[PDB]
Design a protein around this nucleic acid. Structure first.
Lengths: 136, 92, 61, 50, 131, 200, 92
RNA sequence: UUAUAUACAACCUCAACUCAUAUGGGACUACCCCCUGAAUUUAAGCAUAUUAAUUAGGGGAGGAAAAGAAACUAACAAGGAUUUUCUUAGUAGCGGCGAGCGAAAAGAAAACAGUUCAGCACUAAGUCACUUUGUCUAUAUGGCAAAUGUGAGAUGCAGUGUA
RNA sequence: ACUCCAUCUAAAACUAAAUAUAACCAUGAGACCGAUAGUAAACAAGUACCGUGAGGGAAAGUUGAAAAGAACUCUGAAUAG
RNA sequence: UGGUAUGCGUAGAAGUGUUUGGCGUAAGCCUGCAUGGAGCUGCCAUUGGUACAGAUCUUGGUGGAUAGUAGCAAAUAAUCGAAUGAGAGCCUUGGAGGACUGAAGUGGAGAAGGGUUUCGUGUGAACAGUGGUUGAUCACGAGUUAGUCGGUCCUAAGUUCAAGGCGAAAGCGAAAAUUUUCAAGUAAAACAUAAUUU
RNA sequence: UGCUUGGACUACAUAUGGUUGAGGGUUGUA
RNA sequence: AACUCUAAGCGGUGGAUCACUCGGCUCAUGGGUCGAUGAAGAACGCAGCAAACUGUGCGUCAUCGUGUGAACUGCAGGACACAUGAACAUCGACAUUUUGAACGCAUAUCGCAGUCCAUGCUG
């Protein structure tokens, strides 16, 4: 659930807009949170996806899809060869996993015009650039 | 009377020689380095401490292995031996 | 060097040679998919390419 | 201290070597900037301290 | 310098000649061949090799002191030659630093190495005359 | 014009915060800690040793004017027109006291000239001699500082030879000092009016 | 490999001290005093002395110099007189 | 087999290996992907706002990163992944509608490139990792061949084929 | 809400180029600065030095063409003259 | 900085000292003379990190105070005097002699600390707010040997952290401490091998 | 064997293969 | 007289000014090359004479191979091995300490084990 701000119980040093503790919520889904934790222990297997089985009160049940890139079955067999590429190292933290892609919010079009043009950081940078052409 | 006298009772080394960096900054009581986070995986290289990274960086040391990697790249990491096109007989 | 070559000729013909005979290249390069296992194409992609390989033609006047 | 841990003794021992006045024939080199040994740590002038 | 690899920049060029690794230092420390030797071999210049006879075309000597190179002291960018010494106040005769770019090589040592380099110089001599 | 800027981090390295008065030493920011004799010592001011200048040079400084299409062309045509008119040419220098004609037109056989020696033979007879001699003699070591910048100095822009077709004109011409060759297509304003002074 | 044994009888004994005070201990006390490797566990010193110079070693006492080196004071069996052996090693 | 009555062969699930074989961690950190997250300041004060989805913090990659063949853009005589630049635009619009903030489509260009599972009746698991030995030959975690030897796999994999 | 139309096909996966680059390596320029300047550092510079520590962190370039760096004599313990 | 005076220049540039001569209301300019040693300037356009007395300005240097005024004064404090040297109240030192701390020491040891400071030899400038041949200085050498003393080992207060977890991660201003038998184990064998033990 | 020296090994998380195992999970032979 | 004031010449003091600069700065261009096959960084010991910088690891200021072809240089041991090679580059073969992710466990201890192989002594 709610990712209650790690506040000292001292009141959060500033403006009243920042004073919420317990109603402050992950910009990352619980699907992704499940994946990132597994991925640090299992750094040798590369995570494609996560799907849900069941949920009661305190916990949500996921099965996480793990691939062996160092097993020559998975080097072997052409469709999944590209996952062995070093570009896919911990997808989970970069949200190239389905869980992470949704939290970063990359949909074509308009409902996401800001942020689809740039991934979520990138869009900001383009906009706030004075593109100074030489021959002004 | 703790004025210069406060200096006068200073005999107990709070920091000893860093196993990681020798910078003599490891807290006996906390068993932890200021700067170099003493055997807790991470060296604490802060981006607020631009200067700290500057001290800790490549180039402050001899960079022994990694320098050789650079030249071998240009060679396209070949195991073999070039040898000698012409004679060249060693006899006395 | 005579030990080194003695070891090389024994480990020659033998798979999984000792770590120091293994081409110390770079860590990334070693694990980066052998050339055989990059060229691997699905049976269907072989059909697609087999009939239709991009042929060296021309345009125009 | 007074009976120094072995790690300490090695660091101090190296420091004793540094405290030597530069061989005077090295001063005569072509583009020799070295007039003196100038990092001479004299124990009551420059500690090692902290 | 028309090709993109190429320093005209004053600071960079000064890096190169002053900080020169000894093999580049030989090139720098070449001396032109005597008018005699130019007829025989058709070679402009050769990089000073120890037994080479030398006449100093400049300072104080400006013609003659027909002597053999003791050593090419490449780090000082200086060549010292036997018989050419400056009187010190302490009576000590110390060799005059003579740059090889002041010098004629009068006599060339022949090795298989030395001949091969004269021969390279012989073969390129034909080419840009052709051009 | 190639962008120069002062380092943006220069004079901001120093952690210095300014000692409030009562400290008997002036308002300016002063380098903290101890015993280095940089401390504490004069930091951050444009009026300080090691401190950053007011206005620090920034790479955003405007190089180029886009000049109106018709306007540069107007200047170019005016330059070509000045290239005749003998009084203008004398005015810029160019020792042309005994020259065959203005506007000086010479046979197309001039273009074919493979060799520098052959080129000079032509040019002199054609009556360049004094003006080419105006060049080489004048080469002189730069007075500035400009010498370090590879701006070794100025030597005399003698003659602009113009060709329709490069049959080996350019390479022959390139060598000879202050003598520049152009194509009729390109006709540079810089070459026709150097220093905005009409009369090449 | 296998990696060759990095403490040969050679490496163990680097030098004889030959200092003014050390020479006296050859004369009087029948000890040959050696500069040794900081890796040499005393029992290394005995073995190496026995093997190189034929001498039966009685006991070895080991000091670290403030010059980051070892001194090994090697007591010889009464069958072997020091001073002959020092000059067999060629050093007065 | 199952009441404490043994023995064997399976499945599931979880342990034990200095087991055979591999992999992750840490750094660098200009650029970049995320998480996380201020205030000074501005408003001549000040709280929403602004500063700002910014600094600081921390994880993760590559030569670029990420993104990527549209649950798009449109309303047309439609166009047709993504990225960036030119534009729209200091505008639609937001905003104690105060201070201040603000993009995309069409249009123009740079460069261009497309696709595949899984789910249908392959219907004689057609598939795969390993272990040994034949051969080959890198200095192979390699390929060829044999044991049709273990093991994975019908709690599902080949394969047509991806709207 | 009702009644339609147009338009795709989500909640899966792979994918160059154009696009970024204050670091790193290999390079080229400057109407850049010229030793209180310029990077902190042109130099045994992240050094010397301070601080318990995090950190703070300098000052300081130049004989001459060649050392030819003043032999020798004299005064002075000598440095020096 | 573009152009130019076919500018000046090691036969002396620039720089700079200057009761040289002169010009301009001035900003400022030129020249002479001396010094100098390697490069430089006028004019027309072109760009600025463009002109200083100050900012309790910055940084470096230097005065008057003041070749000496504060002072170098607490623990009386020497002193005869032999030796040596360039010089000697101390510091070099004997002999001698006045005293001091007055064994709860200004002594004789060690820890905490120091880091070559210990010690011999050489011994000059700098240092010993004085001298100083001498020193904890400066230069050159040597020296710290252990089965039995400490470290080691052991635990304490307390800590480092593998957990089920939680966290944005790192890590947990955390003692979490859950984790098939996470447990200690036999000079032991028959049927869960057979005793105990988290 | 005792005494002594040298080299090579002995972290953790985890996948696969290996074999030992295990549970009144559950099936079957008796 | 002396001193003081004022000016000038000369000598100090001091390092401004000028001219130089193997450096700095900024823009552009090509490339992608750390790590459990044990990194970056740290410590430690190393030159004939070194104490640092720089270089290197116990084979320690460096070794193979390769290129070039006679230095290094302050003084020298050396210089020889210049024709099989100096010395520098190349550096593709090796070495690459004690550490550090740091890996038996620890670290105001270079502290203390276990295991295999192996050596000497005693038997």
């Amino acid at each position: 659930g709610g990712r209650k701000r790690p506040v000292p119980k001292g009141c959060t040093y500033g403006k009243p807009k920042s004073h919420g503790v317990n109603q402050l919520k992950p910009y990352r889904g619980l699907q992704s949170i499940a994946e990132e934790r597994v991925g640090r222990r299992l750094g040798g297997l590369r995570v494609l996806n996560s799907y849900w089985i069941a949920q009661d009160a305190s916990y949500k049940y996921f099965e996480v899809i793990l691939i062996d890139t160092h097993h020559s079955a998975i080097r072997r067999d052409p469709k999944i060869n590209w996952i062995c590429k070093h570009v896919h190292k911990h997808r989970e933290l970069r949200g190239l996993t389905s869980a992470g892609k949704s939290s970063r919010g990359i949909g074509k079009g308009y409902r996401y015009s800001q942020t689809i043009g740039g991934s979520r950081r990138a869009a900001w940078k383009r906009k706030n650039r004075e593109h100074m052409h030489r021959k002004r | 009377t703790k004025g210069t006298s406060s200096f006068g009772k200073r005999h107990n080394k709070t920091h000893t020689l860093c196993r990681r960096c020798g910078r003599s900054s490891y807290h006996i009581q906390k068993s932890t380095c200021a700067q170099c986070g003493y055997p807790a995986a991470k060296l604490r290289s802060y981006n607020w401490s631009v200067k700290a990274k500057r001290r800790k960086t490549t180039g402050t040391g001899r960079m022994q292995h990694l320098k050789v990697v650079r030249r071998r790249f240009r060679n396209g990491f070949r195991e073999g031996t070039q040898a000698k096109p012409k004679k060249a007989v060693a006899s006395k | 060097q005579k030990q080194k070559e003695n070891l090389r000729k024994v480990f020659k013909n033998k798979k999984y040679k000792p770590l120091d005979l293994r081409k110390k290249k770079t860590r990334a390069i070693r694990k980066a998919l052998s050339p055989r296992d990059a060229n691997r194409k699905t049976l269907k992609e072989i059909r697609k390419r087999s009939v239709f390989p991009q042929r060296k033609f021309a345009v125009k006047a | 201290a007074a009976h120094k841990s072995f790690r300490i003794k090695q660091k101090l021992a190296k420091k004793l070597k540094q405290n030597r006045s530069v061989p005077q024939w090295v001063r005569l080199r072509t583009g020799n900037t070295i007039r003196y040994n100038a990092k001479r740590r004299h124990w009551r002038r420059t500690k090692l301290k902290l | 310098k028309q090709n993109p690899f190429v320093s005209s920049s004053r600071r960079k060029n000064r890096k190169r000649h002053f900080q020169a690794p000894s093999h580049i230092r030989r090139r720098l420390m070449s001396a032109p061949l005597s008018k005699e030797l130019r007829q025989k071999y058709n070679v402009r210049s050769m990089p000073i090799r120890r037994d080479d006879e030398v006449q100093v075309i400049r300072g104080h000597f400006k013609g003659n002191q027909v002597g053999k190179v003791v050593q090419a002291y490449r780090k000082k960018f200086v060549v010292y030659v036997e018989k050419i010494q400056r009187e010190n106040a302490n009576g000590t005769n110390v060799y005059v630093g003579i740059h090889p770019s002041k010098v004629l090589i009068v006599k060339l040592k022949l090795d298989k190495d030395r001949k091969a380099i004269l021969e390279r110089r012989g073969k390129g001599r034909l080419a840009a005359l052709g051009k | 014009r190639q962008a120069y800027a002062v380092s943006e981090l220069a004079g901001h390295q120093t952690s210095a915060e300014s000692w409030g008065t009562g400290r008997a030493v002036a308002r300016i920011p002063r380098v903290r800690g101890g015993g280095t004799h940089r401390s504490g010592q004069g930091a951050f001011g444009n009026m300080c040793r090691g401190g950053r200048m007011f206005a620090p040079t920034k790479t955003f400084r405007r190089w180029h004017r886009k000049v109106n299409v018709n306007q540069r062309r107007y200047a170019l045509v005016s330059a070509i027109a000045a290239s005749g008119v003998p009084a203008l040419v004398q005015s810029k220098g160019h020792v042309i006291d005994g020259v065959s004609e203005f506007p000086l037109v010479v046979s197309d056989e001039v273009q074919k000239v493979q060799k520098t020696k052959q080129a000079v033979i032509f040019l002199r007879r054609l009556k360049i001699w004094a003006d080419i001699q105006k060049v080489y003699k004048s080469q002189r070591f730069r007075a500035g500082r400009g010498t370090m910048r590879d701006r070794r100095r100025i030597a005399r822009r003698g003659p602009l030879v113009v060709y329709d077709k490069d049959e080996g004109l350019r390479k022959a011409f390139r060598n000879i000092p202050g003598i520049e060759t152009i194509n009729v297509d390109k006709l540079n304003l810089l070459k026709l009016a150097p220093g905005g002074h009409v009369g090449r | 490999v296998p990696t060759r044994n990095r403490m040969d009888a050679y490496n163990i004994i680097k030098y004889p001290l030959t200092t003014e005070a050390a020479m006296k201990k050859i004369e009087d006390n029948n000890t040959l005093v050696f500069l040794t490797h900081l890796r040499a566990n005393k029992n290394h010193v005995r073995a190496a002395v026995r093997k190189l110079y034929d001498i039966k070693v009685a006991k070895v006492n080991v000091l670290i110099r403030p010059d980051g080196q070892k001194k090994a004071y090697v007591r010889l069996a009464r069958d072997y007189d020091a001073l002959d052996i020092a000059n067999k090693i060629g050093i007065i």
